[PDB]
Amino acid sequence: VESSTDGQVVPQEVLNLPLEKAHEEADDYLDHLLDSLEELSEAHPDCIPDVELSHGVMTLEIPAFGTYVINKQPPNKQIWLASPLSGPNRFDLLNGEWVSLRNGTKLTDILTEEVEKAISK
Amino acid sequence: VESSTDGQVVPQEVLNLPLEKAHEEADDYLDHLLDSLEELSEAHPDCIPDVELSHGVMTLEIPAFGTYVINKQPPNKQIWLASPLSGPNRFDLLNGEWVSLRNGTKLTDILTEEVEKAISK
Amino acid sequence: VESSTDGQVVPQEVLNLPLEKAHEEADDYLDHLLDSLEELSEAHPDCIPDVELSHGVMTLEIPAFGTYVINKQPPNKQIWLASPLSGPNRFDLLNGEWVSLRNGTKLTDILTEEVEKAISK
Amino acid sequence: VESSTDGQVVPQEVLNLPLEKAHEEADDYLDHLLDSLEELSEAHPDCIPDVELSHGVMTLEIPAFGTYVINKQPPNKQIWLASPLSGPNRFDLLNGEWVSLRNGTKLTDILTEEVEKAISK
Amino acid sequence: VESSTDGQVVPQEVLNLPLEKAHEEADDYLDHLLDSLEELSEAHPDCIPDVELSHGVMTLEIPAFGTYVINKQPPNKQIWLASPLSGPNRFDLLNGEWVSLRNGTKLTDILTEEVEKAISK
Amino acid sequence: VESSTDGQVVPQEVLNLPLEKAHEEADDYLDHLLDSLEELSEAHPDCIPDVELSHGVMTLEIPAFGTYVINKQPPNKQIWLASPLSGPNRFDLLNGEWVSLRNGTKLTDILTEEVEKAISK
Amino acid sequence: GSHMSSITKRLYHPKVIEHYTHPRNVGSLDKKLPNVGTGLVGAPACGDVMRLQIKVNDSTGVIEDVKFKTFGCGSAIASSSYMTELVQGMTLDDAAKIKNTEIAKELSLPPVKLHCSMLAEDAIKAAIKDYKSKRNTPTMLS
Amino acid sequence: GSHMSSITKRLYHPKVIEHYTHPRNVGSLDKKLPNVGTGLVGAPACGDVMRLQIKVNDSTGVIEDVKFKTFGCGSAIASSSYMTELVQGMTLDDAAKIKNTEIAKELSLPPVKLHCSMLAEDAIKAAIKDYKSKRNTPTMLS
Amino acid sequence: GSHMSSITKRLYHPKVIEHYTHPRNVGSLDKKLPNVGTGLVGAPACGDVMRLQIKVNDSTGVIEDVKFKTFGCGSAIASSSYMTELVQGMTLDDAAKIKNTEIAKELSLPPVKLHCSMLAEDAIKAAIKDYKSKRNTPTMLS
Amino acid sequence: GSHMSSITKRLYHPKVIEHYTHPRNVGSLDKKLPNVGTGLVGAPACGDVMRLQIKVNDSTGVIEDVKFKTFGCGSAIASSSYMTELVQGMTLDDAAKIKNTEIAKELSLPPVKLHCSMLAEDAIKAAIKDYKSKRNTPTMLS
Amino acid sequence: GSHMSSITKRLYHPKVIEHYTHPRNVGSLDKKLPNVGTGLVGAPACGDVMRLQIKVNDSTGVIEDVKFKTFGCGSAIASSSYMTELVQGMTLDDAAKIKNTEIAKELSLPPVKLHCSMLAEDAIKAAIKDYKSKRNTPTMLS
Amino acid sequence: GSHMSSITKRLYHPKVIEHYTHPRNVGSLDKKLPNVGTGLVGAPACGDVMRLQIKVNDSTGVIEDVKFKTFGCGSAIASSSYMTELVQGMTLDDAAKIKNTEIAKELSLPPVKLHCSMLAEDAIKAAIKDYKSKRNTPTMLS
């Protein structure tokens, strides 16, 4: 109910409803993204060798399929993409999450599917 | 009389006129926000004791209750509002006026509430 | 042969089945825009006696009624159209096509219309 | 009714009361200039074959009577009418409109006249 | 279950019991500091009359008694405070939160106490 | 048919009617080489354990397929492919797809031999 | 610029408005009763009224048909005609995209501003907004 | 803001729910048989509950009426009142994005802390979200 | 910002106009035979008609006297008073381009991008234009 | 990749796809008998046919179930299986963005410019577009 | 684009082929009897076939003659006619690098999105490639 | 990782709890007569309550050799066996800032934080802090 406030605090029993995605700042999204990537990479099938985060540079060494690094594109036309058979795509915010404006759909879901699909077979 | 449209040439009624408000351009948007904020505030000097726009960086002195800045973000999702709870957010068009996509609503309305709640109590 | 899907296919039956409008990238849009201009040029008596293509700028002029020039502005609300009458307005990608986040307008189609409005009279 | 005075004002009798030609923003003059060009363009046999604006440089063709270039001139001697066999007639604001301080001319009006002089003879 | 770590993985009936803070990237520390600063900023009717927040520049008007500056200062000994009435002090992390490497301790408590004291008298 | 030249170029079928391979113009070529590489090494997941695509280079981590370095070559014989038992060769266009400058034969075929001899044994 | 022709010729006598109504004058006339239920615009003291009636395939939003009413000028009939021709067989966005200059571009001689002489933009905007409400997609309206 | 008085006034003495029921307490009472729909967000270890019921004109997208229940602190009642008033007669957008921070500032001064008795914001969100889903737009909700 | 008070108070009884004319209402009232000339602007929409009557020594450019009739709006009356005091004994300049913001400022906080509520500026611009014409010189007017 | 296994294995026994026809051969077989609408696609040139019937909770936007029919290559049986698992109990957005490249990734690696041995993606697009039509949203759809 | 005229003109009425064929219709007819083995292209869906037959002086590499067959569109005759005129008495190089753009300029002016209307591009390409193979230069061709 | 085996099987019949107690179930049983002190953590996620204890010589060290008692998953038995191995022969340092990695890799697969199998990591933090408290240095605990 207090600490560190004010959108963050809840008594954890008001959460019978969907909670806000939150901002504070655009960096929040990058952090969340990085975490998602780490989770997916681990439990390796020996197709994903590593996830790296240097010093302001995020490289995503993806399985042997759908290769592309994910860095945030310089001002406007956000986030790099470069599929091997479907070519570049770019993303802008649509509900506190980056959504492709070629096909729609959340960025969060794309990452989920494509890594675990490799782990299977 | 044929210029400049739609208030400086009228058919003698305000009814059924065109107007593409919140366009032409950054000036128009800044003016609009100031017009909402000031109009509501008036007849109370403790509600907003001051507004100053010195660079597009807007300071709102309010010692009385919560207040925040409205800065104009550099090109790529221009304009910003940070509200202490909501945090900072960047607004992109969704109806031809600046819209927080995370919230899913116009910026004009956020200001509307915060001024009008104050003059009351 | 199985080349080059998406696009060319070897069942020859994708021309009646649903598939996303675009998948790469700004290229698709450019082709559709250029294609529309080339088609339009035939059947001009004196309405348009010239179309001019400039490296990185594009003019589609009607001198017999007048029209505004069209430009691409530095990234941030890309392909920003300044029409005097409605002032400047912005166009953004929505889902494989540029639909304005205003009330929904496509820029290729606006040029289509204005040109054939000229051909008429 | 609501907004923007000066900009739009309705007492529903301002269409017969004098009001300053412009008050804001200074892009008003540009809009007005554009109105003159667009209006003139209709009913030309070939008196304008294009209006090509090269990066805010504006040419208003009259090529069977010699063309001219109308463009802003760097600060001091800024904004002028350039036409052949009359040299500079340099314009400065005098009261809400750019009126020459040597004879009371208006440059917008000079283009109107000189273009319809062509349509005529 | 999983994501986005660490307090959002647990049931939060162990929220009371000790758990690692696990800030990622550590940009988050600055956001926490900003939320705390906002908490200092209002909850009084005549203190902290204006918070100025601007791109990389933060000015904080602090009532008659004195003023302090809260900004980061060049790499190492980050978030330095220049008080002219209690001297300058230096801060660096020692256990997941900023701690004065001198007379003081945690930055968060130094700020809390002094601001509340002002509201009283 | 109303699709999609140069994307789809068929009058009904082109699987028995001759037509140019077609390319446009530095994107398509990268897509094609990646496509061939994937086709050739298909039906094994151990052939290539990982592939990564980073700007201006392409790595395919291979522990038994020799060394193929894909890299850009400064303007003049752009894009050089390295053959580990005859050195690097540099390639320039001569049939609408990169042609070797040592035998006058396409790179597609080079990939065919060296990749398929390795998956076999 | 070229003739419609509809320079109040002939035996109507003024415009096609006189020909349609019947009974004439009579000063007791009224228009009743069913109608499609679409956008309305009219500007008294300009002497014009326009009513665009869309019919819409509700599945994806295709203009099946659109017929119009023009009151005001005979010259104005051609601008309305040409837009309604274009708009049919096409998506809802195509319906829109109507300027401002466009109306008086079809007419010939565009000032780059309106007077109230051409109402057509307001008629189409009114109709598509009304449609969005009924289709229960208020998010794209607000 | 200043005291209404927020609590302990007048002749209830805390809140107006206490005055309304009848039966009091009685710990045998039930709310039956139908529920009032919309969004429920009652917290039973914080001792506070708010349930806001919207009514919405579909055609304009305007909130015709919105009423509230406030259980908990009597401070919260004044804030709930003011927002429900404000939102009525106004745009769809007004009813959405409701804060939170606003409630805190309005009552007196903002502690920049969410009490947990200031549930009015979550309550209104639930109601408009439910409404949007049932009219068939849950894909632009999120 | 403080009340005059001159908003339907006191003994007028409703608004300023009531007091001036006299006989009230009477619904057949007319100003005849002479008129006091110069600038007039008035909105029936906002319900306020302003009429400023300047007297100006044309030669030295000094405001000899200035009286005003304001019909409707309590707030304006005080602002109008304060300005007429100031201008007299001083140049044209001070009277010239008076706002808009200034009338609002006097009452309390201006909108800072006003509406058609303050038509006063347009009247003032007309008044300056009128002064230029009776002296005779329209070069500076343009 | 690895085996599905669907090499006419295991204890299928000439195929599971073969078992689903029924009636064999018969040279007079047709699509029968109920339908859900949704996506149906089939190219006889590729020799594949797939029919995905989605069920979607209208209010939530979440895919309750999706079941499949697979006719064609043995490789496709596994593709349909794994995709429907992921999509079920999961977001609309998850349901979308299934392409030939994802299916190739699940199997081995794609041939020259996609396998074109699965029409899974076409079926999903048809089903999604049908859901959009059902709920009546047109701008995001285009 | 302007009439030759040869689209459903004159005295044939469609195509010069009907005016000399024999056997008519007869629906059992085929191409007979000698052939030079040059380029053939045809899309039997629209029932349009084109056959450009070059003759080539081996020594100088010059096209001695080139005649055409046009089946289908009457518009298509003009593409075939004009191209063959140019290419006669001129080098093999003219007959290579045939577009697409050339087709748009000549008469047809399509988007460039094929319909099946023109097959002239494919036809000439076949013919010259066949020539190179017979010539016995495979490196240039590949 | 791989099965030990230890999957709450067999002859116990479920793991440690069944074999050890005696009395079974009985649901009237509690920790008696004494308790084992130090850290304590309860959780609804595994539905059971871990209670660790440590007896370790302390000079420059603290007590941190956590026996890591688990009544949860059978897989969890392996996590305790390896933890007690690792922590011994190592300094206090290693046992602090508890992995996460280690509980996860051991139990099934490594991904980020330990899922919710046990809240043991919080218990280990309690223990290290508890000793620091007891040796009377709270200033190096903070």
Solved with = cryo-EM
**Nearest Cα to C87, choosing from L96, G71, A37, G100?**
G100
Return the active site residues of L. 46, 116
Residues forming a β-bridge with E98? E93
I52: part of which helix (H) or strand (E)?
strand I48-57
Residues B95, G41: C-beta atoms closer than 8 Å? no
Among the listed residues J7, J29, J90, J116, the single catalytic one is J116
Residues 6+ apart with CB under 8 A from I73: I16, I46, I47, I48
Residue K84 φ/ψ, nearest 5 degrees: -70, -40
Residues B42, I110: C-beta atoms closer than 8 Å? yes
Instruction: Residue F58: list chain A partners with CB under 8 A.
Output: 67
Residues 6+ apart with CB under 8 A from H99: B83, B85, B86, B110, B113, H121
**Cis before E44 (ω within 30):** no
- Using CB atoms, pick whichever of J136, J139, J142 lies closest to residue G58: J136
The answer to whether the Cα torsion of C53, C54, C60, C66 is positive or negative is: negative
C-alpha F108/C-alpha F99 separation (Å) is 9
Q: For residue E108, what is the nearest residue in chain A, using CA coordinates?
A: A4
C-alpha I52/C-alpha G15 separation (Å) is 48
Length of chain D: 121
K125 neighbors F18 (Cβ within 8 angstroms):
yes
Nearest-CA distance H75 → chain B (Å) = 12
What tokens appear for G86 in the block?
């274009």
C-alpha F108/C-alpha F95 separation (Å) is 12
Chain G residues near any Cβ of chain J (below 8 Å): 58-61, 91-93, 135-137, 140
Nearest-CA distance K103 → chain C (Å) = 13
A–K contact (≥3 CB pairs within 8 Å)?
no
User: How many D/G residue pairs have CB atoms within 8 Å?
Assistant: 19
Residue H50 φ/ψ, nearest 5 degrees: -140, 145
CA angle B100, B101, B107 (to 5 degrees): 20
C-alpha J37/C-alpha I120 separation (Å) is 66
Residues E9, L111: C-beta atoms closer than 8 Å? no
Kindly give the pairing relationship between strand A58-59 and strand A52-53: antiparallel
Rounded to the nearest 10°, the torsion over CA B37, B40, B42, B44 is -100
L7 neighbors L15 (Cβ within 8 angstroms):
no
User: How many E/L residue pairs have CB atoms within 8 Å?
Assistant: 49
3-state secondary structure chain H: CCCCCCCCCCCCCCCCHHHHCCCCCCCCCCCCCCCCCCEEEEECCCCEEEEEEEEEECCCCEEEEEECCEECCCHHHHHHHHHHHHHCCCCCCCCCCCCCHHHHHHHCCCCCCCCCCCCHHHHHHHHHHHHHHHCCCCCCCC
Chain G contact for C41, CB < 8 A?
no
Name the DSSP class of D37.
Answer: H
Chain H contact for E13, CB < 8 A?
no
Instruction: Residue E18: list chain L partners with CB under 8 A.
Output: 122, 125-126, 129
Distances (CA, A) of I40 to I29, I61, K100: 18, 22, 70
Crossing angle of the two packed helices H75-87 and H120-134, in degrees rounded to 10? 40
Residues G142, H59: C-beta atoms closer than 8 Å? no
Mutate to test the interface with L, among A42, A44, A51, A111 (most CBs of L within 10 A): A42
**Nearest Cα to D29, choosing from L18, A80, B3?**
B3
Residues A23, B86: C-beta atoms closer than 8 Å? yes
C-alpha L98/C-alpha L104 separation (Å) is 11
C-alpha K118/C-alpha K107 separation (Å) is 11
Chain G contact for C74, CB < 8 A?
no
C-alpha I103/C-alpha D5 separation (Å) is 13
What amino acid is encoded at K67 in this protein?
K
Chain C contact for G26, CB < 8 A?
no
Residues 6+ apart with CB under 8 A from J11: none
Residues K125, F19: C-beta atoms closer than 8 Å? yes
What amino acid is encoded at C115 in this protein?
V
C-alpha G141/C-alpha H93 separation (Å) is 11
Which chains have at least 3 CB atom pairs separated by less than 8 Å from chain G? B, C, D, H, J
Residues K111, C42: C-beta atoms closer than 8 Å? no
Burial class (CB in 10 A: 0-12, 13-18, 19+), D2: middle
**Nearest Cα to A60, choosing from A40, A75, A45, A74?**
A40
C-alpha I83/C-alpha I101 separation (Å) is 13
Instruction: Residue B89: list chain A partners with CB under 8 A.
Output: 23
In Å, what resolution does this model reach?
Answer: 15.6
Residue C58 φ/ψ, nearest 5 degrees: -145, 125
What amino acid is encoded at I118 in this protein?
M
G–C contact (≥3 CB pairs within 8 Å)?
yes
Query: Helix or strand or coil: residue G93?
Result: helix
C-alpha K39/C-alpha K55 separation (Å) is 12
What tokens appear for I94 in the block?
């001070």
Instruction: Residue D53: list chain C partners with CB under 8 A.
Output: 69
- Using CB atoms, pick whichever of F2, F10, F12 lies closest to residue C8: F10
**Cis before E94 (ω within 30):** no
C-alpha C68/C-alpha C85 separation (Å) is 10
- Using CB atoms, pick whichever of D3, D17, D99 lies closest to residue I41: D17
Residues E38, H112: C-beta atoms closer than 8 Å? yes
Instruction: Residue H92: list chain G partners with CB under 8 A.
Output: 138, 142
C-alpha C31/C-alpha C51 separation (Å) is 17
Mutate to test the interface with E, among B52, B53, B55, B57 (most CBs of E within 10 A): B57
Instruction: Residue A83: list chain J partners with CB under 8 A.
Output: 101
C-alpha J95/C-alpha J89 separation (Å) is 10
Residues 6+ apart with CB under 8 A from H21: H29
Mutate to test the interface with F, among J100, J103, J108, J113 (most CBs of F within 10 A): J108
Query: Helix or strand or coil: residue I85?
Result: helix
Instruction: Residue A76: list chain C partners with CB under 8 A.
Output: 75-78
- Using CB atoms, pick whichever of A86, A106, A116 lies closest to residue J99: A86
Burial class (CB in 10 A: 0-12, 13-18, 19+), D111: buried
Which chains have at least 3 CB atom pairs separated by less than 8 Å from chain A? B, C, E, F, H, J, L
**Nearest Cα to C20, choosing from C11, C9, C7?**
C7
Residue I63 φ/ψ, nearest 5 degrees: -80, 110
Distances (CA, A) of C3 to C10, C22, F5, L54: 8, 18, 14, 68
C-alpha I5/C-alpha I11 separation (Å) is 12
Residues forming a β-bridge with H51? H40
- Quick count: other Cβ atoms within 10 Å of Cβ K133? 10
Chain A residues near any Cβ of chain E (below 8 Å): 4-6, 8, 12, 24-25, 27, 31-32, 34-36, 39
Return the active site residues of I. 46, 116
C91 neighbors C108 (Cβ within 8 angstroms):
no
Residue ranges with strand state E in chain A: 52-53, 58-59, 91-93, 98-100, 104-106
J66 neighbors J39 (Cβ within 8 angstroms):
no
Residue K33 φ/ψ, nearest 5 degrees: -110, -55
**Nearest Cα to D1, choosing from D16, D12, D15?**
D12
G135 neighbors G59 (Cβ within 8 angstroms):
no
Chain A contact for L112, CB < 8 A?
yes
Distances (CA, A) of F30 to A81, F36, K24: 14, 10, 53
Residues G111, D38: C-beta atoms closer than 8 Å? yes
Distances (CA, A) of L26 to L18, L31, L93: 11, 13, 41
C-alpha K11/C-alpha B19 separation (Å) is 60
Instruction: Residue D119: list chain C partners with CB under 8 A.
Output: none
C-alpha D73/C-alpha G23 separation (Å) is 65
Query: Helix or strand or coil: residue E1?
Result: coil
Q: What is the DSSP string of chain L?
A: ----S-SS-SSSSSHHHHHH-SS-S-SS--S-SS---S--EE-SSSSSEE--------SS-----------S-STTHHHHHHHHHHHTTS-HHHHSS--SHHHHHHHS---SS--SS--HHHHHHHHHHHHHHHTT--TTT-
- Using CB atoms, pick whichever of J82, J97, J113 lies closest to residue A105: J97
Instruction: Residue D35: list chain B partners with CB under 8 A.
Output: 3
**Cis before D13 (ω within 30):** no
Instruction: Residue G126: list chain B partners with CB under 8 A.
Output: 16
Give residue L29's region: left, alpha or beta (phi > 0; psi -120 to 50). Answer: beta
C-alpha C11/C-alpha F10 separation (Å) is 12
Residues A117, J140: C-beta atoms closer than 8 Å? no
Crossing angle of the two packed helices F28-41 and F107-120, in degrees rounded to 10? 20
Residues 6+ apart with CB under 8 A from G84: G52, G66, G67, G68
Burial class (CB in 10 A: 0-12, 13-18, 19+), D95: middle
Residues 6+ apart with CB under 8 A from L32: none
Residues J102, A113: C-beta atoms closer than 8 Å? yes
D46 neighbors C46 (Cβ within 8 angstroms):
yes
C-alpha K131/C-alpha K118 separation (Å) is 22
Residues A90, C23: C-beta atoms closer than 8 Å? no
Length of chain A: 121
Interface of H with A in 32-61 (CB under 8 A): 39-41, 43-46
Instruction: Residue G42: list chain B partners with CB under 8 A.
Output: 16
